[PDB]
Write a protein that binds this ligand. Structure first.
Ligand SMILES: [Mg+2]
Ligand SMILES: [Mg+2]
Ligand SMILES: [Mg+2]
Ligand SMILES: [Mg+2]
Ligand SMILES: [Mg+2]
Ligand SMILES: [Mg+2]
Ligand SMILES: [Mg+2]
Ligand SMILES: [Mg+2]
Ligand SMILES: [Mg+2]
Ligand SMILES: [Mg+2]
Ligand SMILES: [Mg+2]
Ligand SMILES: [Mg+2]
Ligand SMILES: [Mg+2]
Ligand SMILES: [Mg+2]
Ligand SMILES: [Mg+2]
Ligand SMILES: [Mg+2]
Ligand SMILES: [Mg+2]
Ligand SMILES: [Mg+2]
Lengths: 50, 71, 98, 78, 179, 141
RNA sequence: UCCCCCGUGCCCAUAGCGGCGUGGAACCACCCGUUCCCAUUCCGAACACGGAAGUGAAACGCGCCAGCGCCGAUGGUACUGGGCGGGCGACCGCCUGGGAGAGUAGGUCGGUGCGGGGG
RNA sequence: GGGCGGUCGCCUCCUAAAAGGUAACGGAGGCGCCCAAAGGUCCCCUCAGGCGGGACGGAAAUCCGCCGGAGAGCGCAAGGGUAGAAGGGGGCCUGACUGCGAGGCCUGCAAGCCGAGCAGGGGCGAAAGCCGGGCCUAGUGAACCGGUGGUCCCGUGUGGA
RNA sequence: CUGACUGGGGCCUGUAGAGCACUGAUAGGGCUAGGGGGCCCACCAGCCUACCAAACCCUGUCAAACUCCGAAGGGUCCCA
């Protein structure tokens, strides 16, 4: 709460999200991630401000 | 092994003070003098400082006999 | 008291045991919780070759053809005291496949 | 002069749920345990909270014997 | 390669016969390893670690020592976890004799104290920390990296049991006596 | 008085007083012993009142031995207080004793003086406590 | 149809600890080097590789030593389902079954499988 | 008795009577979190203390040898368990996946938890195998009304909104 | 014919009891890291402590929140 900055990871090309946090206090800024979408078959993922 | 930060320890000859120095391992060829300075059972390697180098007219027997005049 | 004990998991219930001495090697295949050694191929019991790391190819073919001769395929491989390095005893017959 | 401390947690209700000599199915929890008081033997799997369950069905058996912990053995029927 | 090895082989191995030893092949005492440590000197020389004692230490013996961690944050001596402070090295090879024959012959002169070191510094199982004071003046280094006094600490570990069996070795190898 | 200086927890329960002795029947220290016969509690005031009544009675010789130690806090609520609202305060530590346990053991005191001294300290306690001497009833083999 | 040694097991301290022996023809360990495949917050100590001129000192096996540790019997209560009573209370007594933990005697420094080597 | 004071939910130990449960304004304490590593796989090592020493050093910094079988540590209070790792160090990655889930523990119901295994596509390891977060138990909130993306399902005669 | 209950077999516990090997308190005795200190000495070149006291070992204990141990019983499953 108010340190975690709970967010969701975007498809980075079209649509989906992944719903896991990234801290604002510790400099974990712009963390790339590979995750499993439905259609695009294990492409890369990045953050969103929501 | 680990070639890298570990240097090759380039050979260099020390100036052979007390016999042959242990040979060319490090690149530091200079000593002051006298690698051993003695045979090392420490055979009184003195240079005669403030102690008994000057032994005339002190640490001697002056002013007469062995002092029979006491009582 | 050094031991690593990679032989403790035992999910697969059939393993190939490897012992590397400083002179030569020998290997067995054990069946778990029964205590019966099925087949084995031992250097200096069959005295194949002098160089100790050239043993692994000929004892790999020999233990492989004796394993297929005894009719066991689904085997495993232990790494108790030793690294998977140096001798490999690589094979292409039997379900170990490494 | 008031009551300092009078609250208590709700019990998570652990314990041995399937004793030996019992016919089971694939998936029955043999013991709900807090720590791993029982170690897995044949056909026994652990989970997240150290809970071990049966992989196959059969007559279960305990205590293969000690020196490492108590054992659970789901033994199949033949 | 060869550095006082004749004194290593025919001034030790037959000299340990007829007065010491059980006179078989391996219980005659010998050298296993000689550990060498910095231990920061007195305290932390800097807030951030600088890694230059690996450079002048790699100059005097030609190898890098491992900078190892610290224990639990007791914080009476501003103790902390991480930011490693160890500077320990064993380095047992013939490279042991490469530096040990240098400091064996250069460190007993060229530093000033009472003549020699303790024969009471022997410990159980024969491992003998000798404990020189500083030697950054004349380890033939010519004042390179004079930050502080900044000594080091040596322990020459024998093989045998007793202090008379390490004492059988070390001053027949060339150590002083009675301080 | 006396009290234990450190505890894991401050307050504890009461329980029951059954059981025979759970150790403490053989004397093994002195030549006499004051042994109890009824289950009750031993307050630190009962320890002090019986301990002073020895050193004030016999003088200049004879070491007194006590083998009782209060580790049970007697819990009592304050006066004119209704029920509930937690436990009461701790006033004095008591010592649970069982029948047939030897509490007080004189040392270096003769027959006709130790019977009298243990008789004086016997009336300081709320328990029928008879007096036993050094017999051959030890636990030796 | 047997002894010795090496792998791999089951018994879960009657298997260990400590001391005293003993063994390398035969395995195994130690050793001599690192030249490459490999490595070390650093080092061939441990993994890895050529060996193998020397060894059983260390470690490792076997044998002995009960004190160190451990295991530990028959009785005897403590305790207690169940039933019957006593005491104002704190708490006790009897019968029927069950039956400890300590302590004592005593035992032990191993028992038993499978696959290989030598005679 | 009511008022004043304290408490209202979750977790740990006891009370709690050797299955589970079990009350009191009974005792002792914690929580409304945190970790891109404090996660997964693979590969190495065994701790805390005591003794003998040291160059400073408190008797605790760092180093060596012996004893030490778990008295340390496991983010956090307590309990269980752990060195035949879950502990400490290093490489590579994000399974801190998506659709499901046999069979169960417990429960009045609602909830909470374990989950072998199937498909797609991955990570580690040569493989055997593991990975659907954290050694575990606390770290939270049913429903309703709405906010932001995708889905193009409905969209009031028709086509769109 | 499965039920309450009972008989024959296993499994489980940590209560009564008992115990100090673990967690703490402890009545004494021996040893004495050291400390007000030292009879007082060129300080280490001591001596007994009737001064205090760490840690260790015995004779002895206590515990709902201690268990190296551990029943009687209870629950569960198979047969009657
Ligand atoms: Mg071990
Ligand atoms: Mg391992
Ligand atoms: Mg190994
Ligand atoms: Mg009364
Ligand atoms: Mg219960
Ligand atoms: Mg009950
Ligand atoms: Mg982890
Ligand atoms: Mg592991
Ligand atoms: Mg439900
Ligand atoms: Mg964690
Ligand atoms: Mg319209
Ligand atoms: Mg329309
Ligand atoms: Mg029936
Ligand atoms: Mg029934
Ligand atoms: Mg019955
Ligand atoms: Mg109890
Ligand atoms: Mg009791
Ligand atoms: Mg029973």
């Amino acid at each position: 709460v108010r340190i975690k900055l709970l967010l969701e990871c975007t498809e980075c090309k079209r649509r989906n999200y992944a719903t896991e946090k990234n801290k604002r206090n510790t400099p974990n800024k712009l963390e790339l991630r590979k995750y499993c979408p439905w259609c695009r078959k294990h492409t890369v993922h990045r953050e969103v401000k929501i | 092994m680990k070639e890298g930060i570990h240097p090759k320890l380039v050979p260099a000859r020390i100036i052979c003070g007390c016999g042959n120095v242990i040979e060319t391992y490090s690149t530091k060829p200079e000593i002051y003098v006298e690698v051993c300075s003695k045979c090392h059972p420490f055979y009184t390697g003195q240079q005669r400082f403030v102690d008994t180098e000057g032994r005339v007219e002190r640490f001697q027997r002056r002013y007469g006999d062995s002092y029979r005049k006491g009582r | 008291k050094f031991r690593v004990r990679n032989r403790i998991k035992r999910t697969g219930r059939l393993r190939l045991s490897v012992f590397r001495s400083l002179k030569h090697i020998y290997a067995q295949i054990i069946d778990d919780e029964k205590g019966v050694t099925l087949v084995s191929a031992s250097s200096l019991a069959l005295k194949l070759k002098g160089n100790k790391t050239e043993v692994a190819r000929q004892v790999g073919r020999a233990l492989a053809e004796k394993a297929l001769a005894l009719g066991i395929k689904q085997v495993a491989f232990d790494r108790g005291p030793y690294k998977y390095h140096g001798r490999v005893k690589a094979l292409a017959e039997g379900a170990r496949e490494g | 002069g008031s009551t300092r401390n009078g609250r208590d947690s709700q019990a998570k209700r652990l314990g041995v749920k399937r004793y030996e000599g019992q016919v089971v199915r694939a998936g029955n929890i043999l013991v709900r345990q807090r720590g791993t008081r029982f170690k897995p033997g044949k056909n026994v799997g652990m989970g997240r909270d150290f809970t071990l369950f049966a992989l196959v069905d059969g007559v279960v058996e305990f205590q293969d014997r000690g020196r490492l912990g108590r054992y659970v053995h789901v033994r199949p029927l033949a | 390669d060869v550095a006082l090895k004749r004194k290593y082989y025919e001034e030790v191995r037959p000299e340990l016969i007829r007065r010491f030893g059980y006179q078989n092949v391996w219980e005659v005492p010998r050298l296993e390893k000689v550990v060498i440590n910095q231990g920061l000197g007195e305290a932390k020389e800097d807030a951030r670690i600088l890694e230059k004692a690996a450079q002048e230490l790699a100059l005097i013996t030609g190898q890098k020592p491992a900078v190892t961690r610290a224990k639990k944050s007791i914080s009476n001596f501003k103790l902390r976890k991480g930011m490693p402070i160890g500077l320990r090295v064993t380095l047992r090879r013939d490279r042991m004799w490469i530096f040990l024959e240098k400091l064996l012959n250069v460190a007993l002169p060229r530093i000033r104290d009472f003549r020699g070191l303790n024969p009471n510094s022997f410990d159980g199982r024969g491992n003998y920390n000798l404990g020189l004071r500083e030697q950054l003046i004349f380890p033939e280094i010519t004042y390179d990296m004079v930050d502080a006094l900044r000594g080091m600490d040596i322990a020459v570990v024998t093989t045998a049991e007793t202090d008379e069996e390490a004492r059988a070795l070390l001053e027949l190898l060339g150590f002083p006596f009675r301080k | 008085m006396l009290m234990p200086r450190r505890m894991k927890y401050r307050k504890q329960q009461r329980g029951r007083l059954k059981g025979a002795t759970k150790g403490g029947d053989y004397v093994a220290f002195g030549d006499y012993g004051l042994v109890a016969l009824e289950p009750a509690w031993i307050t630190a005031q009962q320890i002090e009142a019986a301990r002073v009544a020895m050193v004030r009675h016999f003088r200049r010789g004879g070491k007194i031995f006590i083998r009782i130690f209060p580790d049970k806090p007697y819990t009592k609520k304050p006066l004119e207080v209704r029920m509930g609202k937690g436990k009461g305060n701790v006033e004095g530590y008591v010592a649970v004793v069982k029948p047939g346990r030897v509490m007080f053991e004189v040392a270096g005191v003769t027959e006709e003086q130790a019977m009298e001294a243990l008789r004086i300290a016997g009336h300081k306690l709320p328990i029928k406590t008879k007096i036993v001497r050094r017999d051959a009833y030890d636990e030796a083999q």
